[PDB]
Amino acid sequence: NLYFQSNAMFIEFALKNQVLKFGEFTLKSGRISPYFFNAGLFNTGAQLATLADYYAQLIIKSDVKYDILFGPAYKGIPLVAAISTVLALKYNIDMPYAFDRKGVFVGADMTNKKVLLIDDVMTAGTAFYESYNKLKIINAKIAGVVLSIDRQEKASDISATKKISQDFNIPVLAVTNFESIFEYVKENLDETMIDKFKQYRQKYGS
Amino acid sequence: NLYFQSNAMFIEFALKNQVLKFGEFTLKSGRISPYFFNAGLFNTGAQLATLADYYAQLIIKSDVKYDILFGPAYKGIPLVAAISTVLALKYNIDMPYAFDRKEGVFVGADMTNKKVLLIDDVMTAGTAFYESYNKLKIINAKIAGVVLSIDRQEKAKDSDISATKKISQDFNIPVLAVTNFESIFEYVKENLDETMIDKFKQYRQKYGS
């Protein structure tokens, strides 16, 4: 079982809560996208607990090897607190956690340890590099990255996630991604929306 | 059915996890304390979940009127995230939450024209509370109460009273705490030697608020 199971349940949860939207949106890069995703709209505890559970399941199923959950400031902090809590209470996995600030670190000591970097999105490699350099100083190694979404689109001729993955030789995983959203669209939505997705991928996908 | 459940009292949980210790501890200020307390040492998920459950219970049992849980950066953020998670997972309560940044200026639920319960670890000085108060006042958000891990019930630096008492007096709001000096002192009387009992009495006489 080398693959993760595509997650239609998560997509329905994102849709119901306005985190994932379909239509026509102008992104910061100026690109006209047929979907928009903003996990920042999850703002009540039941939403956070559910999101955290989706992250926990992915971390468990990936079987990635790490010692400490690392949440970079600012989005990684509440995620790691919530994920650590869910891992313990729902899955009996008691994991150490650590945070940094924008003491440089707090929580479990990461010196000479392998950590799993948890964050919302990775549109550029800047944030990753910020963490990598801070952690290197204390001989801490990033064993992998877990995100809410991987848009799988060019940053450069490749995505910022693919570049990190290749250059650092670690898994960069995500709760959902363009492929999963596109499969949801093909199986549920009308032909015009389906074609918008196809054209978008043809132009910006990778 | 959830894991890491128990009826254990907080002090036992803190002792077991090295968050509370009894002995001789010179604080940064020079005050020599007969106990050590640092909730930061609850640094794994099961510990954070259990700490968050203790806060959750205080919050559930209070009649303070509020709409949203506010976690100021940096220590309030993971606490509110964990507390909100526990409320949903264990108590079936769906609580709105919000955070700020240390440096819009807020994230999470819109606090404009709302009442919030400010969650944090400790409050040793009033400087921090004031920063939140001022920032929230700009959006007409009001702090209805504060919840902390511990109330040391001791004088703030250059003051005759604790930072928490000064906040209760000046802002007319309650300051709730998972544990406090009095509760730790009750455990000391019940379980420890007369010499430690005396160290606590003397500390309270010298610095108590």
PDB file of all heavy atoms in Angstrom, chain A residues 166-196:
ATOM      1  N   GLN A 166      12.352  17.272  -3.383  1.00  0.00           N
ATOM      2  CA  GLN A 166      13.494  16.783  -4.141  1.00  0.00           C
ATOM      3  C   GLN A 166      14.829  17.198  -3.550  1.00  0.00           C
ATOM      4  O   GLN A 166      15.682  16.359  -3.332  1.00  0.00           O
ATOM      5  CB  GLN A 166      13.387  17.247  -5.592  1.00  0.00           C
ATOM      6  CG  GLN A 166      12.282  16.496  -6.317  1.00  0.00           C
ATOM      7  CD  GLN A 166      12.068  16.941  -7.747  1.00  0.00           C
ATOM      8  OE1 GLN A 166      12.508  18.023  -8.167  1.00  0.00           O
ATOM      9  NE2 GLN A 166      11.343  16.126  -8.496  1.00  0.00           N
ATOM     10  N   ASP A 167      14.993  18.485  -3.282  1.00  0.00           N
ATOM     11  CA  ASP A 167      16.258  19.008  -2.746  1.00  0.00           C
ATOM     12  C   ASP A 167      16.593  18.514  -1.341  1.00  0.00           C
ATOM     13  O   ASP A 167      17.766  18.330  -1.021  1.00  0.00           O
ATOM     14  CB  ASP A 167      16.250  20.537  -2.768  1.00  0.00           C
ATOM     15  CG  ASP A 167      16.131  21.103  -4.179  1.00  0.00           C
ATOM     16  OD1 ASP A 167      16.381  20.361  -5.150  1.00  0.00           O
ATOM     17  OD2 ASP A 167      15.779  22.290  -4.316  1.00  0.00           O
ATOM     18  N   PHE A 168      15.578  18.285  -0.505  1.00  0.00           N
ATOM     19  CA  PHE A 168      15.809  17.825   0.868  1.00  0.00           C
ATOM     20  C   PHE A 168      15.516  16.343   1.092  1.00  0.00           C
ATOM     21  O   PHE A 168      15.753  15.811   2.180  1.00  0.00           O
ATOM     22  CB  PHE A 168      15.025  18.699   1.838  1.00  0.00           C
ATOM     23  CG  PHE A 168      15.493  20.123   1.859  1.00  0.00           C
ATOM     24  CD1 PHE A 168      15.065  21.021   0.893  1.00  0.00           C
ATOM     25  CD2 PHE A 168      16.409  20.558   2.821  1.00  0.00           C
ATOM     26  CE1 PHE A 168      15.509  22.328   0.898  1.00  0.00           C
ATOM     27  CE2 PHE A 168      16.853  21.863   2.827  1.00  0.00           C
ATOM     28  CZ  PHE A 168      16.410  22.745   1.871  1.00  0.00           C
ATOM     29  N   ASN A 169      15.013  15.677   0.061  1.00  0.00           N
ATOM     30  CA  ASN A 169      14.739  14.247   0.119  1.00  0.00           C
ATOM     31  C   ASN A 169      13.842  13.830   1.304  1.00  0.00           C
ATOM     32  O   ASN A 169      14.164  12.912   2.072  1.00  0.00           O
ATOM     33  CB  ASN A 169      16.063  13.460   0.119  1.00  0.00           C
ATOM     34  CG  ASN A 169      15.858  11.970  -0.092  1.00  0.00           C
ATOM     35  OD1 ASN A 169      14.903  11.550  -0.750  1.00  0.00           O
ATOM     36  ND2 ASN A 169      16.751  11.160   0.468  1.00  0.00           N
ATOM     37  N   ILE A 170      12.699  14.507   1.424  1.00  0.00           N
ATOM     38  CA  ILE A 170      11.717  14.207   2.466  1.00  0.00           C
ATOM     39  C   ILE A 170      10.312  14.242   1.886  1.00  0.00           C
ATOM     40  O   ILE A 170      10.071  14.913   0.880  1.00  0.00           O
ATOM     41  CB  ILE A 170      11.772  15.229   3.621  1.00  0.00           C
ATOM     42  CG1 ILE A 170      11.537  16.638   3.076  1.00  0.00           C
ATOM     43  CG2 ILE A 170      13.119  15.105   4.388  1.00  0.00           C
ATOM     44  CD1 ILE A 170      11.402  17.716   4.126  1.00  0.00           C
ATOM     45  N   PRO A 171       9.375  13.536   2.531  1.00  0.00           N
ATOM     46  CA  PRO A 171       8.000  13.604   2.048  1.00  0.00           C
ATOM     47  C   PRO A 171       7.350  14.942   2.390  1.00  0.00           C
ATOM     48  O   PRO A 171       7.557  15.467   3.483  1.00  0.00           O
ATOM     49  CB  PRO A 171       7.312  12.477   2.799  1.00  0.00           C
ATOM     50  CG  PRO A 171       8.177  12.257   4.042  1.00  0.00           C
ATOM     51  CD  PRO A 171       9.547  12.532   3.594  1.00  0.00           C
ATOM     52  N   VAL A 172       6.614  15.511   1.442  1.00  0.00           N
ATOM     53  CA  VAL A 172       5.855  16.727   1.679  1.00  0.00           C
ATOM     54  C   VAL A 172       4.444  16.255   1.396  1.00  0.00           C
ATOM     55  O   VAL A 172       4.081  16.011   0.236  1.00  0.00           O
ATOM     56  CB  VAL A 172       6.271  17.886   0.774  1.00  0.00           C
ATOM     57  CG1 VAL A 172       5.412  19.093   1.036  1.00  0.00           C
ATOM     58  CG2 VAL A 172       7.746  18.235   0.966  1.00  0.00           C
ATOM     59  N   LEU A 173       3.664  16.094   2.457  1.00  0.00           N
ATOM     60  CA  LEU A 173       2.319  15.526   2.372  1.00  0.00           C
ATOM     61  C   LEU A 173       1.235  16.574   2.597  1.00  0.00           C
ATOM     62  O   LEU A 173       1.506  17.641   3.126  1.00  0.00           O
ATOM     63  CB  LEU A 173       2.184  14.435   3.432  1.00  0.00           C
ATOM     64  CG  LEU A 173       3.344  13.452   3.483  1.00  0.00           C
ATOM     65  CD1 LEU A 173       3.138  12.448   4.621  1.00  0.00           C
ATOM     66  CD2 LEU A 173       3.475  12.763   2.131  1.00  0.00           C
ATOM     67  N   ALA A 174       0.004  16.285   2.182  1.00  0.00           N
ATOM     68  CA  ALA A 174      -1.072  17.245   2.391  1.00  0.00           C
ATOM     69  C   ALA A 174      -2.403  16.539   2.533  1.00  0.00           C
ATOM     70  O   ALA A 174      -2.641  15.501   1.890  1.00  0.00           O
ATOM     71  CB  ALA A 174      -1.118  18.297   1.242  1.00  0.00           C
ATOM     72  N   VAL A 175      -3.261  17.100   3.384  1.00  0.00           N
ATOM     73  CA  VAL A 175      -4.597  16.549   3.659  1.00  0.00           C
ATOM     74  C   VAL A 175      -5.418  16.430   2.370  1.00  0.00           C
ATOM     75  O   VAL A 175      -6.070  15.409   2.147  1.00  0.00           O
ATOM     76  CB  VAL A 175      -5.326  17.359   4.749  1.00  0.00           C
ATOM     77  CG1 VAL A 175      -6.798  16.965   4.844  1.00  0.00           C
ATOM     78  CG2 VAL A 175      -4.638  17.135   6.097  1.00  0.00           C
ATOM     79  N   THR A 176      -5.352  17.451   1.522  1.00  0.00           N
ATOM     80  CA  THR A 176      -5.984  17.400   0.199  1.00  0.00           C
ATOM     81  C   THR A 176      -5.039  18.009  -0.826  1.00  0.00           C
ATOM     82  O   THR A 176      -3.971  18.534  -0.487  1.00  0.00           O
ATOM     83  CB  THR A 176      -7.372  18.069   0.161  1.00  0.00           C
ATOM     84  OG1 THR A 176      -8.075  17.658  -1.024  1.00  0.00           O
ATOM     85  CG2 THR A 176      -7.260  19.610   0.205  1.00  0.00           C
ATOM     86  N   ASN A 177      -5.398  17.882  -2.101  1.00  0.00           N
ATOM     87  CA  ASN A 177      -4.586  18.395  -3.172  1.00  0.00           C
ATOM     88  C   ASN A 177      -5.428  18.568  -4.435  1.00  0.00           C
ATOM     89  O   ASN A 177      -6.607  18.172  -4.469  1.00  0.00           O
ATOM     90  CB  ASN A 177      -3.394  17.475  -3.420  1.00  0.00           C
ATOM     91  CG  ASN A 177      -3.809  16.032  -3.566  1.00  0.00           C
ATOM     92  OD1 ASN A 177      -4.716  15.718  -4.321  1.00  0.00           O
ATOM     93  ND2 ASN A 177      -3.176  15.154  -2.816  1.00  0.00           N
ATOM     94  N   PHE A 178      -4.826  19.156  -5.454  1.00  0.00           N
ATOM     95  CA  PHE A 178      -5.538  19.406  -6.713  1.00  0.00           C
ATOM     96  C   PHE A 178      -6.074  18.112  -7.304  1.00  0.00           C
ATOM     97  O   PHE A 178      -7.216  18.055  -7.769  1.00  0.00           O
ATOM     98  CB  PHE A 178      -4.647  20.095  -7.733  1.00  0.00           C
ATOM     99  CG  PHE A 178      -5.358  20.403  -9.015  1.00  0.00           C
ATOM    100  CD1 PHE A 178      -6.146  21.543  -9.126  1.00  0.00           C
ATOM    101  CD2 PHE A 178      -5.330  19.504 -10.068  1.00  0.00           C
ATOM    102  CE1 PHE A 178      -6.835  21.828 -10.316  1.00  0.00           C
ATOM    103  CE2 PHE A 178      -6.024  19.777 -11.253  1.00  0.00           C
ATOM    104  CZ  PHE A 178      -6.773  20.946 -11.371  1.00  0.00           C
ATOM    105  N   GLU A 179      -5.250  17.069  -7.296  1.00  0.00           N
ATOM    106  CA  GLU A 179      -5.687  15.791  -7.833  1.00  0.00           C
ATOM    107  C   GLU A 179      -6.972  15.319  -7.156  1.00  0.00           C
ATOM    108  O   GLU A 179      -7.925  14.891  -7.832  1.00  0.00           O
ATOM    109  CB  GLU A 179      -4.597  14.742  -7.625  1.00  0.00           C
ATOM    110  CG  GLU A 179      -4.918  13.412  -8.236  1.00  0.00           C
ATOM    111  CD  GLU A 179      -4.898  13.462  -9.738  1.00  0.00           C
ATOM    112  OE1 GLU A 179      -3.953  14.065 -10.304  1.00  0.00           O
ATOM    113  OE2 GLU A 179      -5.814  12.879 -10.341  1.00  0.00           O
ATOM    114  N   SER A 180      -7.009  15.372  -5.821  1.00  0.00           N
ATOM    115  CA  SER A 180      -8.185  14.906  -5.104  1.00  0.00           C
ATOM    116  C   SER A 180      -9.403  15.803  -5.381  1.00  0.00           C
ATOM    117  O   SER A 180     -10.527  15.335  -5.510  1.00  0.00           O
ATOM    118  CB  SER A 180      -7.917  14.808  -3.600  1.00  0.00           C
ATOM    119  OG  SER A 180      -6.940  13.814  -3.344  1.00  0.00           O
ATOM    120  N   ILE A 181      -9.184  17.102  -5.452  1.00  0.00           N
ATOM    121  CA  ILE A 181     -10.287  18.022  -5.715  1.00  0.00           C
ATOM    122  C   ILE A 181     -10.848  17.797  -7.127  1.00  0.00           C
ATOM    123  O   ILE A 181     -12.091  17.746  -7.341  1.00  0.00           O
ATOM    124  CB  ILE A 181      -9.812  19.470  -5.516  1.00  0.00           C
ATOM    125  CG1 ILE A 181      -9.455  19.658  -4.025  1.00  0.00           C
ATOM    126  CG2 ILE A 181     -10.881  20.441  -5.940  1.00  0.00           C
ATOM    127  CD1 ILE A 181      -8.709  20.984  -3.696  1.00  0.00           C
ATOM    128  N   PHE A 182      -9.931  17.632  -8.065  1.00  0.00           N
ATOM    129  CA  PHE A 182     -10.269  17.400  -9.474  1.00  0.00           C
ATOM    130  C   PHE A 182     -11.056  16.089  -9.620  1.00  0.00           C
ATOM    131  O   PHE A 182     -11.999  16.023 -10.388  1.00  0.00           O
ATOM    132  CB  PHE A 182      -9.001  17.467 -10.330  1.00  0.00           C
ATOM    133  CG  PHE A 182      -9.239  17.380 -11.841  1.00  0.00           C
ATOM    134  CD1 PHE A 182     -10.388  17.884 -12.431  1.00  0.00           C
ATOM    135  CD2 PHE A 182      -8.228  16.914 -12.671  1.00  0.00           C
ATOM    136  CE1 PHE A 182     -10.561  17.820 -13.826  1.00  0.00           C
ATOM    137  CE2 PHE A 182      -8.394  16.867 -14.053  1.00  0.00           C
ATOM    138  CZ  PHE A 182      -9.564  17.326 -14.624  1.00  0.00           C
ATOM    139  N   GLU A 183     -10.688  15.053  -8.872  1.00  0.00           N
ATOM    140  CA  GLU A 183     -11.435  13.790  -8.940  1.00  0.00           C
ATOM    141  C   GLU A 183     -12.843  14.011  -8.370  1.00  0.00           C
ATOM    142  O   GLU A 183     -13.817  13.460  -8.888  1.00  0.00           O
ATOM    143  CB  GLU A 183     -10.720  12.660  -8.192  1.00  0.00           C
ATOM    144  CG  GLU A 183     -11.205  11.239  -8.580  1.00  0.00           C
ATOM    145  CD  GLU A 183     -10.757  10.811  -9.983  1.00  0.00           C
ATOM    146  OE1 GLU A 183      -9.938  11.533 -10.597  1.00  0.00           O
ATOM    147  OE2 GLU A 183     -11.203   9.738 -10.466  1.00  0.00           O
ATOM    148  N   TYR A 184     -12.958  14.832  -7.320  1.00  0.00           N
ATOM    149  CA  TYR A 184     -14.272  15.143  -6.740  1.00  0.00           C
ATOM    150  C   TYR A 184     -15.153  15.848  -7.780  1.00  0.00           C
ATOM    151  O   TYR A 184     -16.350  15.511  -7.950  1.00  0.00           O
ATOM    152  CB  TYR A 184     -14.137  15.997  -5.466  1.00  0.00           C
ATOM    153  CG  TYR A 184     -15.456  16.392  -4.871  1.00  0.00           C
ATOM    154  CD1 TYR A 184     -16.080  15.596  -3.913  1.00  0.00           C
ATOM    155  CD2 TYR A 184     -16.091  17.566  -5.265  1.00  0.00           C
ATOM    156  CE1 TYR A 184     -17.302  15.965  -3.356  1.00  0.00           C
ATOM    157  CE2 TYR A 184     -17.302  17.933  -4.725  1.00  0.00           C
ATOM    158  CZ  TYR A 184     -17.906  17.132  -3.775  1.00  0.00           C
ATOM    159  OH  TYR A 184     -19.125  17.506  -3.247  1.00  0.00           O
ATOM    160  N   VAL A 185     -14.546  16.796  -8.484  1.00  0.00           N
ATOM    161  CA  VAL A 185     -15.211  17.562  -9.542  1.00  0.00           C
ATOM    162  C   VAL A 185     -15.693  16.636 -10.677  1.00  0.00           C
ATOM    163  O   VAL A 185     -16.841  16.710 -11.104  1.00  0.00           O
ATOM    164  CB  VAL A 185     -14.265  18.665 -10.094  1.00  0.00           C
ATOM    165  CG1 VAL A 185     -14.819  19.315 -11.358  1.00  0.00           C
ATOM    166  CG2 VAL A 185     -13.999  19.725  -9.013  1.00  0.00           C
ATOM    167  N   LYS A 186     -14.822  15.755 -11.144  1.00  0.00           N
ATOM    168  CA  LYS A 186     -15.192  14.831 -12.215  1.00  0.00           C
ATOM    169  C   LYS A 186     -16.356  13.943 -11.819  1.00  0.00           C
ATOM    170  O   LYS A 186     -17.214  13.634 -12.632  1.00  0.00           O
ATOM    171  CB  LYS A 186     -14.031  13.922 -12.560  1.00  0.00           C
ATOM    172  CG  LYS A 186     -12.859  14.556 -13.228  1.00  0.00           C
ATOM    173  CD  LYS A 186     -11.742  13.498 -13.265  1.00  0.00           C
ATOM    174  CE  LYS A 186     -10.429  14.034 -13.755  1.00  0.00           C
ATOM    175  NZ  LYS A 186      -9.365  12.979 -13.688  1.00  0.00           N
ATOM    176  N   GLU A 187     -16.386  13.528 -10.562  1.00  0.00           N
ATOM    177  CA  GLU A 187     -17.418  12.604 -10.121  1.00  0.00           C
ATOM    178  C   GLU A 187     -18.702  13.236  -9.599  1.00  0.00           C
ATOM    179  O   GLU A 187     -19.683  12.525  -9.424  1.00  0.00           O
ATOM    180  CB  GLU A 187     -16.827  11.659  -9.076  1.00  0.00           C
ATOM    181  CG  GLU A 187     -15.684  10.828  -9.643  1.00  0.00           C
ATOM    182  CD  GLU A 187     -15.021   9.940  -8.620  1.00  0.00           C
ATOM    183  OE1 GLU A 187     -15.557   9.815  -7.496  1.00  0.00           O
ATOM    184  OE2 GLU A 187     -13.958   9.352  -8.947  1.00  0.00           O
ATOM    185  N   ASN A 188     -18.716  14.554  -9.399  1.00  0.00           N
ATOM    186  CA  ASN A 188     -19.878  15.240  -8.831  1.00  0.00           C
ATOM    187  C   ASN A 188     -20.409  16.459  -9.584  1.00  0.00           C
ATOM    188  O   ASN A 188     -21.613  16.719  -9.553  1.00  0.00           O
ATOM    189  CB  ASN A 188     -19.562  15.710  -7.396  1.00  0.00           C
ATOM    190  CG  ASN A 188     -19.421  14.565  -6.407  1.00  0.00           C
ATOM    191  OD1 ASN A 188     -20.418  14.024  -5.922  1.00  0.00           O
ATOM    192  ND2 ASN A 188     -18.177  14.240  -6.043  1.00  0.00           N
ATOM    193  N   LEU A 189     -19.536  17.211 -10.244  1.00  0.00           N
ATOM    194  CA  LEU A 189     -19.950  18.468 -10.875  1.00  0.00           C
ATOM    195  C   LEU A 189     -20.176  18.391 -12.398  1.00  0.00           C
ATOM    196  O   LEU A 189     -19.860  17.385 -13.042  1.00  0.00           O
ATOM    197  CB  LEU A 189     -18.956  19.578 -10.525  1.00  0.00           C
ATOM    198  CG  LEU A 189     -18.626  19.760  -9.033  1.00  0.00           C
ATOM    199  CD1 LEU A 189     -17.815  21.027  -8.853  1.00  0.00           C
ATOM    200  CD2 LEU A 189     -19.866  19.799  -8.152  1.00  0.00           C
ATOM    201  N   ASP A 190     -20.720  19.470 -12.956  1.00  0.00           N
ATOM    202  CA  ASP A 190     -21.062  19.517 -14.384  1.00  0.00           C
ATOM    203  C   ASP A 190     -19.843  19.645 -15.300  1.00  0.00           C
ATOM    204  O   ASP A 190     -18.748  19.984 -14.862  1.00  0.00           O
ATOM    205  CB  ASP A 190     -22.091  20.629 -14.661  1.00  0.00           C
ATOM    206  CG  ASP A 190     -21.512  22.008 -14.525  1.00  0.00           C
ATOM    207  OD1 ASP A 190     -20.567  22.340 -15.264  1.00  0.00           O
ATOM    208  OD2 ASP A 190     -21.975  22.751 -13.642  1.00  0.00           O
ATOM    209  N   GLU A 191     -20.057  19.359 -16.584  1.00  0.00           N
ATOM    210  CA  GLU A 191     -18.986  19.359 -17.582  1.00  0.00           C
ATOM    211  C   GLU A 191     -18.246  20.681 -17.755  1.00  0.00           C
ATOM    212  O   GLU A 191     -17.063  20.678 -18.078  1.00  0.00           O
ATOM    213  CB  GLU A 191     -19.514  18.892 -18.951  1.00  0.00           C
ATOM    214  CG  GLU A 191     -20.632  19.756 -19.539  1.00  0.00           C
ATOM    215  CD  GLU A 191     -20.993  19.374 -20.974  1.00  0.00           C
ATOM    216  OE1 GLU A 191     -20.408  18.403 -21.513  1.00  0.00           O
ATOM    217  OE2 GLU A 191     -21.864  20.062 -21.564  1.00  0.00           O
ATOM    218  N   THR A 192     -18.931  21.808 -17.590  1.00  0.00           N
ATOM    219  CA  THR A 192     -18.248  23.095 -17.774  1.00  0.00           C
ATOM    220  C   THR A 192     -17.222  23.333 -16.662  1.00  0.00           C
ATOM    221  O   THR A 192     -16.126  23.833 -16.919  1.00  0.00           O
ATOM    222  CB  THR A 192     -19.230  24.271 -17.883  1.00  0.00           C
ATOM    223  OG1 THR A 192     -20.077  24.292 -16.731  1.00  0.00           O
ATOM    224  CG2 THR A 192     -20.090  24.125 -19.131  1.00  0.00           C
ATOM    225  N   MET A 193     -17.572  22.959 -15.433  1.00  0.00           N
ATOM    226  CA  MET A 193     -16.648  23.094 -14.302  1.00  0.00           C
ATOM    227  C   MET A 193     -15.489  22.113 -14.492  1.00  0.00           C
ATOM    228  O   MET A 193     -14.340  22.454 -14.273  1.00  0.00           O
ATOM    229  CB  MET A 193     -17.374  22.863 -12.967  1.00  0.00           C
ATOM    230  CG  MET A 193     -16.497  23.025 -11.715  1.00  0.00           C
ATOM    231  SD  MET A 193     -15.619  24.624 -11.590  1.00  0.00           S
ATOM    232  CE  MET A 193     -16.986  25.789 -11.650  1.00  0.00           C
ATOM    233  N   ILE A 194     -15.805  20.895 -14.928  1.00  0.00           N
ATOM    234  CA  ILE A 194     -14.793  19.897 -15.194  1.00  0.00           C
ATOM    235  C   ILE A 194     -13.747  20.412 -16.194  1.00  0.00           C
ATOM    236  O   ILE A 194     -12.552  20.237 -15.993  1.00  0.00           O
ATOM    237  CB  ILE A 194     -15.426  18.575 -15.712  1.00  0.00           C
ATOM    238  CG1 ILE A 194     -16.186  17.864 -14.582  1.00  0.00           C
ATOM    239  CG2 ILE A 194     -14.356  17.656 -16.275  1.00  0.00           C
ATOM    240  CD1 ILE A 194     -16.996  16.630 -15.023  1.00  0.00           C
ATOM    241  N   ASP A 195     -14.201  21.042 -17.275  1.00  0.00           N
ATOM    242  CA  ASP A 195     -13.280  21.543 -18.286  1.00  0.00           C
ATOM    243  C   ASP A 195     -12.424  22.695 -17.754  1.00  0.00           C
ATOM    244  O   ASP A 195     -11.253  22.804 -18.094  1.00  0.00           O
ATOM    245  CB  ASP A 195     -14.012  21.971 -19.560  1.00  0.00           C
ATOM    246  CG  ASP A 195     -13.056  22.254 -20.691  1.00  0.00           C
ATOM    247  OD1 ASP A 195     -12.210  21.375 -20.980  1.00  0.00           O
ATOM    248  OD2 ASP A 195     -13.131  23.350 -21.280  1.00  0.00           O
ATOM    249  N   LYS A 196     -13.009  23.553 -16.925  1.00  0.00           N
ATOM    250  CA  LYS A 196     -12.240  24.652 -16.315  1.00  0.00           C
ATOM    251  C   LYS A 196     -11.059  24.090 -15.513  1.00  0.00           C
ATOM    252  O   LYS A 196      -9.957  24.650 -15.502  1.00  0.00           O
ATOM    253  CB  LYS A 196     -13.130  25.494 -15.402  1.00  0.00           C
ATOM    254  CG  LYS A 196     -14.143  26.360 -16.130  1.00  0.00           C
ATOM    255  CD  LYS A 196     -15.012  27.118 -15.153  1.00  0.00           C
ATOM    256  CE  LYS A 196     -15.887  28.138 -15.865  1.00  0.00           C
ATOM    257  NZ  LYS A 196     -16.702  28.947 -14.907  1.00  0.00           N
TER     258      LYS A 196
END
